[PDB]
Design a protein around this ligand. Sequence first.
Ligand SMILES: *Sc1ccccc1C(=O)NCCN1CCOCC1
Length: 184
Amino acid sequence: ESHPVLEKLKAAHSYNPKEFEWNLKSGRVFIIKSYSEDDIHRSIKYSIWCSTEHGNKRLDSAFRCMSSKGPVYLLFSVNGSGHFCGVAEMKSPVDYKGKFDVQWIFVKDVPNNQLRHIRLENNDNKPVTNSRDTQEVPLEKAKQVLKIISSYKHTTSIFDDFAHYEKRQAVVEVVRKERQSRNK
Ligand SMILES: *Sc1ccccc1C(=O)NCCN1CCOCC1
C-alpha cells in the first residue's frame, strides 16, 4: 500500500539523484533544526519552510546575497533524532510570520555517526551534528557533508512513515475544527 500523495511527489521529483554535484563551485550551506517529523513531512509535500523570526532573517539575507550566483542548501535534522533526514535547496526569499520556497533533493536518513567526524571551525570546532538552527557550514566542510549524504546507502527515510503523517495531519485538522466549533 503506497499513498497517492507520495506517489505523486515521487513521480514529479527526482529524489536522491545519483548524479549530484557535491563538489560545489559556489554556494552556502546551513543546518536546519526542526521541532518535529510533522514539519518535515509538511515541508516535503508543500515545498515550503518557516524558520524562527531570527532564523528567517538569516536565511533571507543569505539567499538574497547569493543572487543566484550559487545555491543555498539546507541540511535537515529534527532535534534529538540522531540522524539527518534530507537536504533541500532554498528557492525564494522569505515572505511575511515568514515562509519561503524550498526544493527537496535528498530524502533519506543519514545517522549522526557518519557525520560526527566533520567539525565546524566557526562554531567552537563542534561536530556538525551538534549544530543549532541556521548554523552555517563552511564550504569545504559542506562538500564533505554533501558527499557523505549523497552517497550514503540509506535503509530508511521519512517516506516509510508517510501514510502515518498524512493521517496525523488529517485527524489534527478535524480535532481543531470541532474544538473551535465548541468555542462558538
Ligand atoms: S509554516 C511551516 C512550513 C513548513 C513546515 C513546517 C511549518 C511550521 O508550521 N512550523 C511551526 C514551527 N515553526 C518553528 C520555528 O518558528 C516557526 C514555526
